[PDB]
Amino acid sequence: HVEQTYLMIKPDGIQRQVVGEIISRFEKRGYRIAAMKLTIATPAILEEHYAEHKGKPFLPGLIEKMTGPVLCMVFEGVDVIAQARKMMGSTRPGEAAPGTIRADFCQQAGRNLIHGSDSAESAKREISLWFKPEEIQSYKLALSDYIFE
Amino acid sequence: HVEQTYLMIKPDGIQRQVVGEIISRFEKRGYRIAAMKLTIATPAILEEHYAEHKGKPFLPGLIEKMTGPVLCMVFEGVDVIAQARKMMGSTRPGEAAPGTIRADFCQQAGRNLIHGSDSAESAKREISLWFKPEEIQSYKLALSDYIFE
Amino acid sequence: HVEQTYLMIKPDGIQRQVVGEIISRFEKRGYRIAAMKLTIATPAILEEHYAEHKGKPFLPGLIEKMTGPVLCMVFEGVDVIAQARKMMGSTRPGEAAPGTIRADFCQQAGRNLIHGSDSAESAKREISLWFKPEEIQSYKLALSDYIFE
Ligand SMILES: Nc1ncnc2c1ncn2[C@@H]1O[C@H](COP(=O)(O)OP(=O)(O)OP(=O)(O)O)[C@@H](O)[C@H]1O
Numbered sequence A, B, C: 001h002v003e004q005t006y007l008m009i010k011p012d013g014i015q016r017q018v019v020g021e022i023i024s025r026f027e028k029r030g031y032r033i034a035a036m037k038l039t040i041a042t043p044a045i046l047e048e049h050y051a052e053h054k055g056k057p058f059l060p061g062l063i064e065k066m067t068g069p070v071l072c073m074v075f076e077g078v079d080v081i082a083q084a085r086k087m088m089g090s091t092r093p094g095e096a097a098p099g100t101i102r103a104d105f106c107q108q109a110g111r112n113l114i115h116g117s118d119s120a121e122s123a124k125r126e127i128s129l130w131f132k133p134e135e136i137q138s139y140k141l142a143l144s145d146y147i148f149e
């Protein structure tokens, strides 16, 4: 039983040129790349992505920080929504555990390199927001017998 | 005072071709390779290895997963039995801490890449099962003065 | 606001030839190298460095272990004093969290690879002990807009 999560490399991940390192951390667990697209995020899509923060005082600055190149991604694996959140670490890098992306790469929450869906409902919504169904690619990893019990 | 632990790369570690990465994690701490051998695990040896689980419903499938190439290893260091367990992380990769082998490489307990002895008694038993005493090598690490206090 | 911490690679870090790896861990978070100097630590300077341990029974052996080549460093970043301590891990490598320097490289407290200031007051004192003000270099990281919120 696998699931799919939406992971997005933020403009800081692009500009610091750590895209490959980020992808490698998820590939290392045998997570499958189901979708991937470079785009430039717009305020319109970011308002919907961050709909849960509508009307809040930090939202305008958050949208500004995120208006730039982003790598949209879908990864598949067992419990991958919760596991990817664990791998990213706490929102504030200073509170994130050693060995997580945010602790290993970042200093402040406003430049914390990566987004990941936080629940099954948010993963389904975010994947549908950033990807059309034809962009989601179905294939089986050749090492599946050695990844899944 | 140093001790020795039995560590075994399971068929998934061989087939995913991460043997060198695993070894490097233990070398990085100045643990000494006291024994190393590639073999193919068979049911009769695995039944001894997993003797405590004789008769449990999960055992036949466990033996099937483990019937394959394995890298038998003995590493030596301070508190190495407990430390190697900590480095591997929880049996269930989803519960394992970031930075541990199972958290960094794996998804499920049935394919969790590596075995390590859980106690002094188990290390003696497992080293005797998988190695002949001839295969344990005695030598001193040249960097000892900078590894040990 | 950013702050500055004193970090020192101990003789074991020099002799095990892991200097670059240590530096890379701090650079990876966008911490800025403000000062760096290779020297050979001597008892007189180490007595001042370890002044808080004056008169204690273990101090003589600590000074002996530390008499050797060291890399003096100053790193700058948000909350860098506390964060560098978190990255180093517990004094005892066996208690340190996976993903920390001491857990990843070391076995025992007496050979734990690296020193870092434990407080704002000790950072100011240690930077002044090991560096003259003219050795502290001020420049801005080109990726600042993507590191700091
Ligand atoms: N009170 C606040 N003041 C300023 N910025 C905030 C505040 N709360 C949240 N943010 C910003 O909102 C961003 C997203 O916040 P959220 O609570 O969704 O965290 P997250 O789930 O870790 O992030 P993401 O969805 O990007 O993975 C954080 O990176 C932070 O920059």
Ligand SMILES: Nc1ncnc2c1ncn2[C@@H]1O[C@H](COP(=O)(O)OP(=O)(O)OP(=O)(O)O)[C@@H](O)[C@H]1O
Residues within 6 Å of the ligand: B149, C058, C062, C090, C091, C109, C110, C111, C112, C114, C115, C116, C118
């Ligand atoms: N009981 C001990 N056995 C061995 N070494 C010790 C012991 N106590 C202290 N040391 C050594 O003394 C150094 C200074 O001790 P302290 O309590 O200041 O730890 P620390 O703050 O982690 O170390 P450092 O200042 O080197 O970063 C320790 O890093 C360790 O190298």
Ligand SMILES: [Mg+2]
Residues within 6 Å of the ligand: A118
């Ligand atoms: Mg969020």
Ligand SMILES: [Mg+2]
Residues within 6 Å of the ligand: C118
């Ligand atoms: Mg100290």
